[PDB]
Amino acid sequence: TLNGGITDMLTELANFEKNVSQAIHKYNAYRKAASVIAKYPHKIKSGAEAKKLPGVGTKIAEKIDEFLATGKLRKLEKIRQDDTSSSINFLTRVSGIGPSAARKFVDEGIKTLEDLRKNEDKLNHHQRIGLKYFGDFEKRIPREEMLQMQDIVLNEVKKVDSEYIATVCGSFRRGAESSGDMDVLLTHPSFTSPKLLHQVVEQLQKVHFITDTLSKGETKFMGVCQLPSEYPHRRIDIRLIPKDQYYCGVLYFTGSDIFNKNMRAHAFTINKYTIRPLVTGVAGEPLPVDSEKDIFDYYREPKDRSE
DNA sequence: CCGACAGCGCATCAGC
DNA sequence: GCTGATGCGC
DNA sequence: GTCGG
Numbered sequence A: 001t002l003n004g005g006i007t008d009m010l011t012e013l014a015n016f017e018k019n020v021s022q023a024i025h026k027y028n029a030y031r032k033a034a035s036v037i038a039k040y041p042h043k044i045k046s047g048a049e050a051k052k053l054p055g056v057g058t059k060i061a062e063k064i065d066e067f068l069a070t071g072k073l074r075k076l077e078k079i080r081q082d083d084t085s086s087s088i089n090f091l092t093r094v095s096g097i098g099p100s101a102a103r104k105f106v107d108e109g110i111k112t113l114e115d116l117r118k119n120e121d122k123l124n125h126h127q128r129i130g131l132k133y134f135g136d137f138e139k140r141i142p143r144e145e146m147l148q149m150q151d152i153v154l155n156e157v158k159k160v161d162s163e164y165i166a167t168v169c170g171s172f173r174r175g176a177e178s179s180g181d182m183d184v185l186l187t188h189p190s191f192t193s194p195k196l197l198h199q200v201v202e203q204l205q206k207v208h209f210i211t212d213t214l215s216k217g218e219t220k221f222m223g224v225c226q227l228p229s230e231y232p233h234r235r236i237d238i239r240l241i242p243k244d245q246y247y248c249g250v251l252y253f254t255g256s257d258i259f260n261k262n263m264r265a266h267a268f269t270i271n272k273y274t275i276r277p278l279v280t281g282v283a284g285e286p287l288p289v290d291s292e293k294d295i296f297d298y299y300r301e302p303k304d305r306s307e
Numbered sequence B: 001c002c003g004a005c006a007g008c009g010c011a012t013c014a015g016c
Numbered sequence C: 001g002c003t004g005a006t007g008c009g010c
Numbered sequence D: 001g002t003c004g005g
């Protein structure tokens, strides 16, 4: 909020690079710069000042100078009024429509949500669902609803087989007051490093909790769910992970992104699967893990895992 | 100067 | 029909 | 776009 003008500018630049220019690394550069500035506890008076922050270089410092002196960015104002670029950028807000699809659509005169509605045959299954729940997917989920959603998931999972273990991770596990989606990690003692995932998904569809499917395989389900009453439709992912790699998965999918990076950087090598020792760099076999604390013993409650 | 910049499952396409 | 590449979300 | 070897 203290430098919201600058961070919004950088975020807008970020999106354009990712969505229109298809330059993912420049997207991430702008985001990294936006993040380090948003955490900066002073009102920025110059680009030179911001330049001192890691992730802010010459080009962004120059842009900040323009923004501070004029209250805007010339090229950013031009991009906003550009029909092609703004349409491409907007279409990517539809889940399933990335930079490639967005560009192709705009190339053939398809630029709006209404245009998408008139051209259903040109959309794949995922994109049709993204279109259908466009507004709902951009809503956040209050913790109270997440709790009700957790109630349903844990209940139905245990009814299928009481030996399943299910954990809602992500921001919810970190105790966030709101969440963007629901991330569920699933395991079963019969699965280590059968159709375990299918049976869970089917039961959730049976009680009319899961309403649509974006993608589904033996280890990962991505779909849509809805609380009964009208509640917005929500995004839910369910991952089946081997029992012996469960808690590494729980750690990884709990977050936050900043905490995860800082944890393995201050670590051994830690990925989503295992933790293995490193010698000349030759990684050994995975270490035995039966809890989150074991990783730390090689502690931070989820409540404080922002960094 | 110049390469890194995370890594994975699934859906779908390109090539054969 | 197949294998591998690409797009996509996250 | 920025960083760092």
Ligand SMILES: O=c1ccn([C@H]2C[C@H](O)[C@@H](COP(=O)(O)NP(=O)(O)OP(=O)(O)O)O2)c(=O)[nH]1
Residues within 6 Å of the ligand: A169, A170, A171, A172, A176, A178, A179, A180, A181, A183, A252, A253, A254, A255, A256, A257, C010
């Ligand atoms: O690009 C990504 C994003 C997330 N992840 C993992 C790490 C993260 O902790 C986990 C949860 O992703 P969310 O984007 O769902 N993080 P959070 O769930 O904590 O934010 P929200 O409440 O917005 O989902 O998925 C990746 O591996 N790659």
Ligand SMILES: [Cl-]
Residues within 6 Å of the ligand: A022, A023, A024, A025, A026, A027
């Ligand atoms: Cl790039």
Ligand SMILES: [Cl-]
Residues within 6 Å of the ligand: A271, A273, A274
């Ligand atoms: Cl591994």
Ligand SMILES: [Mg+2]
Residues within 6 Å of the ligand: A170, A171, A179, A180, A181, A182, A183
């Ligand atoms: Mg989440």
Ligand code: NA
Residues within 6 Å of the ligand: A050, A051, A052, A053, A054, A055, A056, A057
């Ligand atoms: Na800097």
Ligand code: NA
Residues within 6 Å of the ligand: A091, A092, A093, A094, A095, A096, A097, A098
């Ligand atoms: Na999209």
